[PDB]
Amino acid sequence: RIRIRLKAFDHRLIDQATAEIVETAKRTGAQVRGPIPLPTRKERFTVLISPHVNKDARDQYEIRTHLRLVDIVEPTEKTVDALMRLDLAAGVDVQISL
Amino acid sequence: RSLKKGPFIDLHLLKKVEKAVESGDKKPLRTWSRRSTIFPNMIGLTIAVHNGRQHVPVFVTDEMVGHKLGEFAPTRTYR
Amino acid sequence: GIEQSGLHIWSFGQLPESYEQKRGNYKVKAWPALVDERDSVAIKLFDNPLEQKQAMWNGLRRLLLLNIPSPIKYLHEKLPNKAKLGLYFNPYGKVLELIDDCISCGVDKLIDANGGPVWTEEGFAALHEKVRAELNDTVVDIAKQVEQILTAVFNINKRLKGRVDMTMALGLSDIKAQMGGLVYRGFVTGNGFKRLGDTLRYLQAIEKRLEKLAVDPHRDRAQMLKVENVQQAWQQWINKLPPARREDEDVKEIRWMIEELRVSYFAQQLGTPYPISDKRILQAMEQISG
Amino acid sequence: NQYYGTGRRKSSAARVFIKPGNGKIVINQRSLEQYFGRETARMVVRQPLELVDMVEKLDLYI
Amino acid sequence: NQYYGTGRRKSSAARVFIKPGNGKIVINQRSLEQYFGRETARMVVRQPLELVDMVEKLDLYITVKGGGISGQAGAIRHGITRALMEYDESLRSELRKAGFVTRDARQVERKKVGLRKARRRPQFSKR
RNA sequence: AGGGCUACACACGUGCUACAAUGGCGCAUACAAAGAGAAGCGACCUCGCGAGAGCAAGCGGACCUCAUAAAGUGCGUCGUAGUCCGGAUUGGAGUCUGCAACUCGACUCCAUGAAGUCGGAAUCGCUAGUAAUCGUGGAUCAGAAUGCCACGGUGAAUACGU
Numbered sequence: 001r002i003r004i005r006l007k008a009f010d011h012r013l014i015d016q017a018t019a020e021i022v023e024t025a026k027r028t029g030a031q032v033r034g035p036i037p038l039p040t041r042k043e044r045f046t047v048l049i050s051p052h053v054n055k056d057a058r059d060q061y062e063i064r065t066h067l068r069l070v071d072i073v074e075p076t077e078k079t080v081d082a083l084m085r086l087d088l089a090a091g092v093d094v095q096i097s098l
Numbered sequence: 099r100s101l102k103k104g105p106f107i108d109l110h111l112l113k114k115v116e117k118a119v120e121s122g123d124k125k126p127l128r129t130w131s132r133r134s135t136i137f138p139n140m141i142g143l144t145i146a147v148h149n150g151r152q153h154v155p156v157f158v159t160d161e162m163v164g165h166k167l168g169e170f171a172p173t174r175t176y177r
Numbered sequence: 178g179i180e181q182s183g184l185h186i187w188s189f190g191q192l193p194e195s196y197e198q199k200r201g202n203y204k205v206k207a208w209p210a211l212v213d214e215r216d217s218v219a220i221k222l223f224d225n226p227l228e229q230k231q232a233m234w235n236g237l238r239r240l241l242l243l244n245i246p247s248p249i250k251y252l253h254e255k256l257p258n259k260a261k262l263g264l265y266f267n268p269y270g271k272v273l274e275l276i277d278d279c280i281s282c283g284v285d286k287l288i289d290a291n292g293g294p295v296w297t298e299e300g301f302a303a304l305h306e307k308v309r310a311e312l313n314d315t316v317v318d319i320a321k322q323v324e325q326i327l328t329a330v331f332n333i334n335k336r337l338k339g340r341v342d343m344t345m346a347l348g349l350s351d352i353k354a355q356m357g358g359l360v361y362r363g364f365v366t367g368n369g370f371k372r373l374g375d376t377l378r379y380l381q382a383i384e385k386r387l388e389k390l391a392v393d394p395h396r397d398r399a400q401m402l403k404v405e406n407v408q409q410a411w412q413q414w415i416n417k418l419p420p421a422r423r424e425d426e427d428v429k430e431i432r433w434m435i436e437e438l439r440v441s442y443f444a445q446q447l448g449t450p451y452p453i454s455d456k457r458i459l460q461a462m463e464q465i466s467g
Numbered sequence: 468n469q470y471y472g473t474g475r476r477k478s479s480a481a482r483v484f485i486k487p488g489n490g491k492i493v494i495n496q497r498s499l500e501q502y503f504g505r506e507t508a509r510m511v512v513r514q515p516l517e518l519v520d521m522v523e524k525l526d527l528y529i
Numbered sequence: 530n531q532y533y534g535t536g537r538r539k540s541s542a543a544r545v546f547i548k549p550g551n552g553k554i555v556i557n558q559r560s561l562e563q564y565f566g567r568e569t570a571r572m573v574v575r576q577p578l579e580l581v582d583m584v585e586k587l588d589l590y591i592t593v594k595g596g597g598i599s600g601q602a603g604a605i606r607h608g609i610t611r612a613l614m615e616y617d618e619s620l621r622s623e624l625r626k627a628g629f630v631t632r633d634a635r636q637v638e639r640k641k642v643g644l645r646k647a648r649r650r651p652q653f654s655k656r
Numbered sequence: 657a658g659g660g661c662u663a664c665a666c667a668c669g670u671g672c673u674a675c676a677a678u679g680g681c682g683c684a685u686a687c688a689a690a691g692a693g694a695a696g697c698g699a700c701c702u703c704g705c706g707a708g709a710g711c712a713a714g715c716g717g718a719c720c721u722c723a724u725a726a727a728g729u730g731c732g733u734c735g736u737a738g739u740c741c742g743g744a745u746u747g748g749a750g751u752c753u754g755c756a757a758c759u760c761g762a763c764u765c766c767a768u769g770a771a772g773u774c775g776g777a778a779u780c781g782c783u784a785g786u787a788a789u790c791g792u793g794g795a796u797c798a799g800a801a802u803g804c805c806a807c808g809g810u811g812a813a814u815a816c817g818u
Contacts (some may be wrong), residue, residue: 001350022254039718044691044794046642046805055804056643067718075350077405077487081524096379098337098355099750099757106756130658133756150659168758173659258701264715265700395523399489539785540689540808564686567729569810578725597809598687598728635785637689640806645671649787652780 002080004070005095011066015077017089018068024086025072029079111161115140128153132168149173179209182219184327185243187305189220191297192233196222211236217245234294235321238284245309252276252308252313256320263324266331272389278363279323283316284308286370322373323365329380330360336387344394355439358432372433378437385444400442407435407458414462427465434458483522488526532587534612536604539636541596543604545612550588556605557592570602577610577629581620607632 004021008014018035025032043063058076072079087094100106101138108131118127119139128146136158149171159161179193195206212219218236223229238243242248253276264272287308288294295301333356337349359376361367368376390397409430415423422428437449438458474481493514494502503509517523532547554575557562565571571580578584580605591608593601610629638647645651 001353002346003686040692044806058642058805060642065786075430078245079341080347085520094340096343098341098346098349101752101756102750108756131756132658132758146657148678166758171758173759176663262701262712396488398524402487541687568686569728593687596688599810623810633785637785637808642805645781647786648782650781652670654780656779 002072002075002097003095003097004083005097006066006068006070006092007095008066008092009064010091011064013089013091014066014068017087017092018070020089021070021083021087024082025070025079028082029072029074029076031073033069033071033073034049036069036071039067040067041065102165107134107137110121119143126155129167132166132171135166136162136164138163147171180215180220180222182214184211184218184220187240187244187298187301189298194249194296195226211240212393214241234285234288237288237294238281241284241308242280244305244364245312248280248309248312249277252280252316252320255313256317260320260324263327264320264430266327274321274363275365276320278366279319280312280316280375281363281366282370283312284394285366286314286319287312289370316383319365319370319373322377326360326373326377326380328375329384330356333380333383345390347394348386348390348397351404352386355379355383355436375433375436378440380435382384382440382444385446386452389443403455404435404442407438407455410433412460412461414466418466431458431461431465434461484528486526486528487524490523491526492529494529532612533617534608534614536608536611536632538603538607539596539600541593541600543591543593543601543605543608545589545591545605545608547587547589547609547612549586552585553588555590565598565602565651568598570599573602574609577606577624577627580627581616582626583615602648603633617653641642 006014006017006021008017022032022035028093041063043065045061045063046058047061048054048057049059072083105166106130111131111134114127114129115137116139118124123143126144126146128148128149132147140158140162141160143158144155145158145167145169146155147167147170154171156167179189179196193209196209198205203432207222207224208226210229210232212221212232213235218239220236221232223232253273256276261272264275267275288304291304291307295304333352337356339351341349359368359379364376365373386397391392415428415431418428434453435458437451437453438455440447441449441453468486469473470485472483472485474483492499498511499512503512516525530548534545534547536543536545554561560566561571561574565574578587589609591605593604593608595601598605606629610624613624621630640646
């Protein structure tokens with residue numbers, strides 16, 4: 001009922017984010033649906049490494065954007081007042097859809 | 099082939115053409131806008147279109163009006 | 178055999194109000210009614226006059242819509258297509274079932290205006306000729322009002338979905354709950370003709386919540402605490418009643434009392450049919466606790 | 468949904484009862500303005516709420 | 530009480546359910562002669578069942594997802610050769626001896642930079 | 657501001673499409689992966705033969721959209737004919753983008769119908785999901801790919817030996 005979505009570039013960091021969210025949710029509420037993982041936005045780049053010549057000399061990079069969902073079932077004012085102002089994670093952002 | 103909604107002309111070329119044809123043919127009109135389309139009000143008139151260095155004079159007959167100004171002025175000179 | 182199946186035309190005459198037989202010393206009573214089969218109508222016996230009335234009501238709706246010469250396709254053809262796109266605002270998608278529900282909301286409105294379900298073929302014909310002559314064109318109001326309530330659903334949806342904040346999300350969760358309570362599968366026949374205007378008033382209150390919500394959560398927070406406390410009172414009171422008293426109508430108006438209370442909190446430019454406060458909801462509930 | 472706290476000092480005892488609210492406080496059936504006249508006492512009664520920013524989230528019967 | 534297996538192949542994976550029966554096969558709520566019977570690989574799906582005993586005495590509801598036609602068929606094959614694991618090593622040994630328990634490791638691999646495809650290098654000229 | 661970078665008696669490089677019957681065409685029909693999308697992808701409905709146009713949701717996206725994958729299979733047909741091959745080129749008329757498409761876009765409708773019937777000296781790539789062949793997406797980019805980078809379908813032959 002409260003769809004909690006996390007996007008990061010670091011899977012480790014977003015696990016410490018999800019652990020905090022789900023643990024506070026279990027602590028002051030009930031019925032979490034776990035840290036739902038979704039397919040990573042695996043975004044592909046390739047560029048040239050020589051400034052003038054050598055079409056065949058390239059480099060390849062990627063972005064691994066990691067997705068998470070939590071989906072709290074009971075939107076009780078207590079647990080949402082706890083889950084707010086306390087996520088505070090560095091390299092994630094949050095979606096709180098209904 | 100182009101915009102259906104309005105065959106194109108340059109605005110200043112349109113107003114020059116009107117002030118020429120309503121006052122009568124008296125001087126060959128020099129211009130740069132090759133992007134413009136020839137209209138039936140231009141028939142019988144003498145234009146001097148820029149090809150990059152000079153202006154080629156063109157006289158406007160009946161069947162000019164289905165074509166543009168830029169086709170009648172070669173800018174690449176091949177011997 | 179009065180109780181049959183596969184029935185499509187009221188040839189029953191004066192349908193029995195009750196069925197009675199005798200076995201030795203003692204009698205046996207029953208209540209015969211119609212039954213909807215989604216393909217045809219049947220007649221089955223029942224042991225309670227109220228649920229007999231509900232079953233005969235449903236079978237009468239099916240028999241009536243079968244006996245009327247194509248009101249369904251008539252309204253499909255004659256209905257405005259902009260209104261049909263308003264129906265296509267449906268999150269469920271299907272529009273034909275929505276028109277089925279709105280025609281049903283015409284049918285019960287006309288039966289209530291004519292005086293309820295009757296047992297006789299003469300009453301059947303008297304209601305049937307009039308619902309033929311009038312059903313094809315009274316449901317234009319129902320269709321356009323479902324169009325308007327779907328425009329309200331459209332606007333509230335475009336407010337709820339998107340970039341949302343948790344101070345907003347406290348209010349949006351309750352708005353979602355109100356949306357689920359009001360609009361659902363066949364909501365027009367769910368609430369009935371008498372409440373269609375009142376639902377538009379409810380969505381006007383839902384609209385008027387959001388301007389105060391976006392400028393101050395705290396006043397909205399306190400008023401939603403008031404609504405929350407009467408709502409949990411509603412739950413804990415209606416869940417201890419006897420099961421018939423969990424489904425009767427006189428216990429059913431208290432949800433609409435709560436919605437009128439929501440109107441009286443959030444949008445007083447629109448008004449309520451009668452003055453309402455939390456004291457009035459509580460005097461209602463301990464008045465009808467029985 | 469009534470929760471309990473107690474507070475004892477030198478020869479003193481206070482009972483406090485928690486409600487969700489808007490920021491009203493009543494002590495001994497009078498307001499805190501007609502009660503404590505010293506502003507640091509107002510500070511020490513508000514400072515637990517002001518520490519964890521529930522200052523207008525709730526009401527409290529004390 | 531149901532024989533189960535899961536097989537995989539190139540871009541494909543299959544879930545197979547088997548029970549004691551009398552010969553029926555159902556692929557994605559359709560028949561094998563409808564789904565492979567008009568083209569190749571209609572026999573790789575059945576052949577381990579004829580090699581093992583009890584060829585008629587079972588019937589099976591199978592499904593497969595992903596990959597092409599032959600990849601789906603090979604996924605079915607590996608799924609069945611697994612799914613008879615309730616029948617023990619007494620026939621699992623000869624099944625591996627025929628070489629059917631091994632998951633196929635071949636996958637289509639990546640295009641490289643400076644290459645038209647997998648290994649085909651564009652034409653080298655002028656020496 | 658316009659022209660030029662896009663010229664043209666020619667020579668070379670790398671590719672695309674063919675010279676067809678293991679196929680051309682019509683109908684029906686089954687199976688993928690991966691990626692993109694807010695000045696964006698853009699359902700459905702309606703118009704047109706179509707490019708597209710009107711209306712217009714859903715989607716910041718395992719939801720919606722791009723998106724019908726195509727070679728594959730079953731039928732009918734062609735019948736070895738420069739032939740129902742190939743489509744160059746050219747004429748008329750349009751669709752979109754963009755202030756604007758002549759120099760100098762791309763795409764669609766009709767008509768046309770080259771050369772080309774497997775290519776000398778020579779020469780390239782490839783050891784297994786590889787070669788070969790069939791489509792799909794992306795970046796760049798308003799519009800612009802036979803280019804480049806990815807994705808999957810079917811799926812080889814041969815390796816005695818130095």
